[model samples]
Target: THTLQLAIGDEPTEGFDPMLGWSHGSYLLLHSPLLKQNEDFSWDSLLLSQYQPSDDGKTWLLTLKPDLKFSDGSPLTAKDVAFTYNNAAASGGKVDMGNFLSAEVIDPLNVRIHLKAPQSTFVNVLGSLGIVSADKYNAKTYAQKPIGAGPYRLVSFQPGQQMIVEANPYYAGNKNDFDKLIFVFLDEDSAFAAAQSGQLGVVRIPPSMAVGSVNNMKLWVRPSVENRGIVFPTTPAGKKDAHGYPIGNDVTADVAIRRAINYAINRQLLADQIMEGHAIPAYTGVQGLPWNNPDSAIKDGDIDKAKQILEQAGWQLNSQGTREKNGLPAKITLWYTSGDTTRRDLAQALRSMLKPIGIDVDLKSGSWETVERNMHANPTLFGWGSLDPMELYHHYSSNAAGVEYYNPGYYKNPMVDKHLQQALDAPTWQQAVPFWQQVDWDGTTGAGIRGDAAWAWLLNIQHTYLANNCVDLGKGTPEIHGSWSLLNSIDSWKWTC
Candidate 1:
């Protein structure tokens, strides 16, 4: 029996906890479709064979695929679906399933979801949520051993090492190509070494490592929707001092200071030199993601204008080329994850660019945990990417999960908030575009959050996958629902030999 060995950079946090396992490795195993694809990435029909929306869009009726059983042999029904959503909502879990859905099970096969408001993206949210066997699983027990109805069933887990999932003979889905799937967690050096030695079937090469060589592997690069940027904590949001502690009120709250930092850095030079031609210059945080306009108004880097803006705001450039405003030096510390070679290089490059513009940037690097803790307390260079535009809302919107680091830079503008809400409430991409465009152009809304110099958006990173020649990925874009990559469709993969 051929087993596919998948190597990941980070270890799986716990078991296959859907809410807890938002990381790259956990996503691949826990949330792949139980059945087939729906309209877009919406969750309307997974266990359900069919679903229809009501005339007013307030109610949705879902019909389950009958006789479907989970890995434990318990039949999946409408009750399970309802229980799953309600539990996720009540637990204040990683996933915000409650915000989008209010559900009811009409019968064994039938379920109804009532929306609090008219939402177009709700279906997409439904498509992305993982359904558990509510009859046997709860928040506590589910995290340890989740009973899913997908192509494979979890057999055993070796914490911080590997997870073994074997094919379920009675699965009501497409045939899984491999007899068993092994997810191995390896450090960066070991992972690349395994890929080179052919012990691993698939792996992700660090962006820095992939430079100057495409030999012995297919270098798959596509235009990405993900953006990398830096958030500045202004006085009102980031009430902290330079030593990574609270100062109660810092000068970063001033719009002029934020805009000055925006104009001070050279985005094009950083993109070309640091990225090694792998990235595009980003003036807005929403760059490269869906709803992003190529001609969006926020573009360009102007050092002279940046200096002038600070000068007008009472900042004077001293002989040594550092600005002083209100009796303080124009010095700020920039932090990045120490082990992330790409972000570290970018931070160094950023320090060089801002120095010439009279802003003194101090470079600091540490572990992911340390950086995350000091994100709001200090200015830092950070990299974030995701498959959905909602990631923007989550990162920039006040109080989003997994984004506590530096979200204090989230400037609240009622107009941008309204447009963002409109986009979320929109039922389809067609309906959402206009509202997104309004936010992108008007600058009154959060569109200006990234563009108006709140954060320095560096690049939209391409998703790269390295696979051995033996694995045949059929012709289709890998089903990447909710950050899960091509491996989501591992059931359809086949061995060429």
Candidate 2:
């Protein structure tokens, strides 16, 4: 077959505009990036032939490949690259450019990017931001009809149905024989039914749906660094949210309560039974990454230790078997997205795990709006796993407290912020690894289970998929979060049989 059929979930709500976060985590199919991330998470020049960093590490000079062109035959020059960065930074979109200053055009093929600070993580933008034509880009219409220099261009898009893409005529990369790509938006059950009728060549499913095999498809258990955890509101109840809902829980405000819960939970049970062995127990968000701290790793299910810590901190069991200290009960409402079974199961499992330690957990499921309204005062199940270590800054830094989904529990530690800043100021990503590790635990105090216990991280999930027997998904790097598109190598896919 010349067409590749895939059910890869919903299209972006903001449309395909790169500035507003269209292809941030996935392949920039309709737009070419200056560089691409290799399977080993190393950077490789794509549109750029050479890139040089200034001595201060605040400036980067990028030289584009000779004779680059958009799919519509327009020149793809440094102007387009500069425009993309500057506009994306100003748009205040999901594409994080907080450290970006401005882009200065050196020549038609060269551009100099300036940063407010020495940020080695800025290299991620070069490898992910989809560059668009400066002349053709319109914030209003660009999302619907994107034009760029990537391997594929959109031919048509049907809301709530499907999107059809054709190979870019001006693409300069190694071309695959596949003539067309069809991405259908389907839920897990619907996708499975579609695969049963031979409608889809590829389908993404949860581990729960992987119990049985399809007629002609092979299960592809792709590994990922995507992780889930429960966030603890570290402050006592007193402040009010914007909507006047109570913020912070008195019981969870105690450090001992947080520390005990960390030691009490069984991450192995969650991984083996709940995740069906498709996941590994995780203590911190950057589990498999180089920046991960071995010191933060905890022994799963230490009930005795958990009890010891709680008792030492003045929490004693009452007649009802729930711990209390000075009249406040050791109970907190845990929230999760209602529809996600994986999150729901994990929340239920946490109730059982913490019960033996004299903690009472009240389970609640609702929309994200509901969770966000109360997350500052309650524990909530959330998932976040990315290749970027800067995400650590967002999770533990005092400055990031209550900033969207980041640091929702209002976790603030000056030492953790210092370590994160040290990582960000390093000359390169490799040099920043040690500092990032320190953010997890520097012996005396940190963010993970051993330190302030800001979060009780559960497990790292593996993305599961089903592909036609004839299709070869190819060996690639572990996925970042959801899809294998972050290090997208779709151009190298082949039909083996």
Candidate 3:
């Protein structure tokens, strides 16, 4: 049995079992012929044989494959489909089955879904939710070990170490060639060591390591749908607001200051040096996804313009090369999570670029836990991106739940809010494009809202996979469905022979 050993950064969280797991784990489990495939990521005839919408586009009917069965020999039915979605919605934001409103079983083979409102991306959301077995699942026992209808079943978990999966003999789908799969959770240094020693069959390399390791191993690079950038705090340097907190709002809240900072930092240099040419300069929030505006104008670094903008905004460069306005220094402390070499390197690169423009950036690093605790209290350089545009919406848009690191910079625009809301409410990608474009276009001006809004876009980190030359991936070997690999297509992969 050819067991594929994979290395990942973090262990599966306690909440992972029932919530379709995190993005990486969920990509493998949720798409393994267990969940219904919709028209979002790619067309695959696995869980759902067919899906069609009614005239109004509010109701969607899904038909399941008759031969589909769970690992325990129970046949997959419409009740299971309905039960999975209904349970997810009732659980109150626990499961990420894509804003599920309601689901109903029409028959043993068919299920219908009713959306709270028209969402064009609704199908893609449903496709992401991996289907679970209804009859075998008990809410109490589900979190410990959930019963899934995928080709592989979880065999063992070693907490912070690794997870083992074995092929499910009763899975009613194309069989995977490997008998066992092990996911090893290791730190960046350890992961690199494992990859170098051939102990890991496949692994993810940090952006900082991409260049040095590419020549030694096969490299698979794809545009990451994720957006990575920084957010300035509202607290100004000297004054105190009504809440008794020091006002750090002047630099971040000022439109000119924000634009100046955006233009001052160089993204291309960071991509080349820190990311090893694996990262792309991002203008709009959406990077590689369908909603991304290709024509979005990214502000490349211009030292003269950066200095002029700050100067026009009442900031004067002092003898020490630090800008001062109202007798206050234009200095901002940016924090990022420690142990992430890519982000740390990028932050350092940014400091170098901004220093020439008379902006003082104090770069600090802390552990993930420490950073999260101090995120709201101070400004920080952060990295975030996902395969879905909802990732962007939930983070930047107001009234979104689950985003603790909200917009502390106090960026507000009624038109941007309106356009984003319209895009979210639209029922289809085609219908949502105009509104999405409106948000990117920044009214009548050809320059994007990114420049005017004062948010600094750093880089869109690329998704990379390191693999040995033993497997035959065929024509679909290099498929880039966003930042993650389409590993669920492993059944189609054959031995090199």
Candidate 4:
């Protein structure tokens, strides 16, 4: 039996429970989804035999492929699907469960999901929560060792030690003679060193480190997963909040002012300087996705136009070199998590870019929790990305008001909201793309929040991985954000003959 050895850049957090722990370490081979996506955005059948949404988009019927079994040999059935979704979400699974109305098991293989509203992004919602075994579903106990129906089973996982997995004999798919897959955790530098010295098989690398492929290895530069930029107060901040993020905005609250700041920042410079030619300059959170409209991208910065926009809007520069609008200074506070070198660098870049335009940017350092809470309360530096355009919904949507998912400015619009909802309600991905792109900036009304400059979107972060030539990792699927990469197709990787 062939053995595979790999290394990950970051280690996993404690929670591995399917419901709450939907992150890096668990799913590589231990768990499976009802339906999975290809690198090209096409669907492939996995645990699910098929899933069909109703015409109205409120109901989704899911059928599982038969004869499936967990690594423990327990029968894998639709009841498990219903059980997992209901309990994980209801018991504070940390997943988006607000729109989910109910789940009904039709029989052993079929289950139906009912939504409170028309949600076109149902498939993506489900893909986030992998199905777990119903009989073995115990949150506390399973956190240590998750039980699932997939190609491989966890043999043992000791933190800071090499985690091991073996092929599941009862797996319904093609069996593998590669008896085991071993994973060692290492930092980016250590991992690169290991890969270079013929110790580790795969490693994540910096774009600058893509120097002619280390150790004669193959490089897979994954797609951009996040947009790094500043978040302004949707409206004026009135007072100081508990977390210290500004509770009020002065000039940024004005739409024209926001647009000026948006156009003022040079996205290309950020990508080239800070990211070292690793990322693409982006205008929206999910830009460059198949569903996003290419025309909506921010072509290039126009410092001249940016100044004109601000001057016309009446935010005049004063003696102190800061613009004052109706007696308020045109200064913004940028927040970044402390100890984060990359974010700090990006923040400094922002400071340099905005200074020329008389916009004073104060770099604020804090923990993520503190920054997240004070959002919209003041200008914030943030980023988020996803396979689906729903990311737009989460970041800019009215729905995020309850949780303050970083719309700190408290931005909203009837047309922008309408387009997002329409996209979600659309019957298919093709049908949804246009509506999703409309949120990029609705050209018809010239009222899209993006066009209005809700955020000064910067660059999309690129993720790169290095794999040893001894193993064939197949094609590298671009990832949005996470510690693990190249495991979506873990089943296909093999040692070269």
Candidate 5:
């Protein structure tokens, strides 16, 4: 069996241009980066032989591994690294290079990346931005047929059909056990059917589909950082953003209401029941990450505590069993993506759980476009998690307020912002950890379940997959998101049978 067929998820619509935000946390199978992230979230050299950080911590001088060549046999050099970083910064795509000033090639093997400020998380960019051949790269057509010095080389790709790749002849790393890898782009249902028919070597599926058994397959449930939660609107009613999007929710604006919701919902129950035990209770988006603050989490489902918080805040039970305070009812319209069954189920559970506490959670489902239109004013069911600590800054920072889905709630707190800046100012990732945690909860205040309760985190999903009996996936890092495949160590996979 020289070929391994898999149906992980949809092909990247944006294609495999790493600079344009492809292969996010996962390695770039078709292209190599200067560094790679280890299981412990530390940096490992890939194309880079060594890296030197300046005393100021704002500059990084990277030295490349010698004689690196692309799949097409073109020399991979510092010029390409500089080109990719510069392009990423200017492209305005998903690759976050906000602090990045520029990347300059010192020589054929050495490149320097300069940043406006000391951002410890810039190492993530080093590990994520896959280098490309500057000479052959065309912005318009590069994604269709990318060439780099990675382990795999693209053979063929048919949009919305399948992508075939083979081990790069010139790759200088561990070659894949399977020479050819076929990634079939199929919807979830089709993927399950394909797996059942023995058409796929491995297939990723939703928890709901991870039943007792598949004829020749084994169910594998691996932990992931991916989490789903409810984002609360932090501002009071009657407000509008610069884009004229409606802002604020009187119900969620009350800290007591938000805290009560956080306490009332049984996250473990949701994980066991709604997610079918394929998830762990999550208190924050960065649950497994180093930045997660344990103090931010509380005992799961404190119904009595939830009621006390509401009652203490003058939220008296009304005639209809709903709480009301200062003429504002403890009722909120929660929005979730219309077609997402998991979100719908979670929303339903929230509604049911809050009823006893005199809080009315009116569930609303709509398209993303519809949800976005009113997201600022309504608490919405959302999903977010990643290896980078920047995710925390983006969602909780006042600077990111009303910037798309990043901080749709318009959550603002000076202390949270101060701690976030402290993290950014830290010279190293190790030094930044405390500040990052402080952003969640720093004794007095922050944006977390125990603090502002900006979001009511529910569960961290474990990406459940079905693999054929013969397939040995080997030990690999759990995916941070379901959309991303757990194929970081695909080269190590073997046909055990």
Candidate 6:
């Protein structure tokens, strides 16, 4: 049987639940019904043949692929579409569509989704959350034993060891040339060991690790949508604590303080010296795309400017090389995934950059689980990306789910919210574009929330890979939102030799 293999580390926590999936492992298997993303990060039809929104832009009509079915030989229907979204409302999926009202089945091959308000990102949202079988919807162990409607089906899993999958005959999209696939777990050293020895077909690498071909292999460099940045919690935003109580004014509360830190951190330094030409500097929520143009783009660090801002705000650099304002030290806990090589490098880069400016960063490299658990309270080196403008809204919007998924800093602004709302209410991408553009610099030309330093947006990351002679991956489509969903088209791939 034709088989393709992948090498990587770690496993997803939630078995395979679409909304619950927070790992690359889960993305390798499941997907959405319609509005699927092409390799170019553009929208393409999947289970949906075509779609149109009502004049009001609140109701979307989707024409489905006739005869869609699950691997179990069960029919997939518009009712299933309704079931998936209704379940999202009940369960709170990471896609976070609180504005989604309900779904109506027009027939076996058509469905309609009604939104409380017009959402410009509605299609992008559909492209992100994979649909599950309504028949297996409430299974006690469905997360582990997922019954998704994608082109690949999980055949076996080895937890920390490996996972194997097979092509789905019931898939309504294109099929890959391979018959089977295996995802093996290996450390960076071991993964490279296998690649050099011609033992594995493909592997992902960081920019610094990019190397020429070895053992009849070649390297592939693809630009990506992995937007990396740092996060700072608002001193207070009317959110409850772990004790189910409310408090106000934590560490990063002052507008001038956040602004000063933004000026202190250099995005170009990381993109050039650290990421080494594999990435570009970013200032706003969106990156590498036109909607976030020169106006919203991240700026170079100016230590003198940063210092002036602090001094003007009555902040004094004390003997500890830390800033003090009204008896409070300019400090924050900077956490990163303990084992992530890039994040570790980033943490160090920030320390060196901010130390001279008197902002003390207590760098903590620990379990990613711990970082996520404590994210609500501390500043951390974080990364996020997507091809859509909604990427900005999800992180900054008050309507987005909780303190996890993406936005860890609890922030709120009526101006930002109103602009986002207007963007969604527009009918076309062209008309809708400027609204999100305003989120960077408001209509008044003031530093929008992004200019106000919602977070120190840093880099739009790049993707590097190694492939053996046996497989030809071609040029991969760019990634959006740090997902391997680019592999969603593996079914259409063929071997080289």
- CA lDDT of every candidate: 0.63, 0.82, 0.65, 0.73, 0.83, 0.71
lDDT of 1 by residue, 1-497 (tens): 35788874465555565555234445445444323443243333446688776655566778888998877788888887887666666564566543445679899998887777666555555655667776677667877777876667788888878878888665766675687888888876787777777777877654445444433555544344455777776445334434455521255656676777677666767766765565666766566444665556343467888778888988898777788877777778887877666777888877787777787888888887777666665676766665455655665454442245535454455566677777777765456766765655563434453444456666665555677776665433322322335554565678766
TM-score of 4: 0.88
Kindly provide the TM-score of model 5 when superposed on the true structure, using C-alpha atoms.
0.94
Error of 3 at 80 (Å): 0.3
TM-score, per-candidate, Cα-based: 0.78, 0.92, 0.83, 0.88, 0.94, 0.78
**Model 2: lDDT of residue 347:** 86
lDDT string for model 6 (1-497, tens) is 33667874446555677755333435656554556666545678778887888877788888887888886668888887788777766674455774689988888888888989877777666776667677667645877777877878888888778888888888888776777888877777888888788777778766766466578777766767787777777655466656453323355777677788788888877877777777877776577665674566545588898899889988898878789887888777777888677788888888889898898878887787777666666776777776777777787776762545565676676687888788878865567888878877774633343455667777888776787766766544456454354474465567866
Give one digit per residue, the lDDT tens place, for model 2 in 1-497.
45778886666455777787533443466766777666667788878889987876799999988898888889889899999998888875657775889999999989999999899788877766788889999888987788878888888888888879888878867566577888888777787889878788888777654368688888887768788888989888899866776778898889898889888988888888888888988889888777899677878799999999999999999999999999988888898888877678788888999899989999998898887887888888999888777888889989988877899888889898899998889878778889999987898899877788898888888877788898877766667665435226567767886
Kindly list the per-residue Cα lDDT of model 4 for residues 65-157, writing each as its tens digit: 888888898898988999988886787656776468888999999999988877777777676677788887777898788887677888878
What CA RMSD would you report for each candidate? 4.7, 2.5, 4.2, 3.1, 2.1, 4.5
Tens digit of per-residue lDDT, candidate 5, span 1-497: 55788888776566677767654432366877777677787778867888977776799989988888889999889888898888887875657675899989999999988999888888877776788788988877887777887788888888889888888988866775688888899988878888889888888888755386788898877778788989999998797978788899988898999899889888888888888888888888888777888676679789999999989989999899899998888888999998777678788888999899988888889998999888999999998878889999999889999887899999999999999988988888878899999987898888986788899888888888889888887766657674645767665777786
Please count the clashing residue pairs in each candidate, in the order shown.
12, 1, 13, 13, 0, 6
Q: Least accurate stretch of 10 residues (summed lDDT) in model 3?
A: 475-484
Clashing pairs in 6: 31-130, 175-491, 176-491, 235-250, 283-298, 385-481
**Ranking according to lDDT, highest score first:** 5, 2, 4, 6, 3, 1
- Evaluated at residue 199, the lDDT of candidate 2 is 82
TM-score computed on alpha carbons, candidate 2: 0.92
Best by TM-score: 5
Best prediction by lDDT: 5
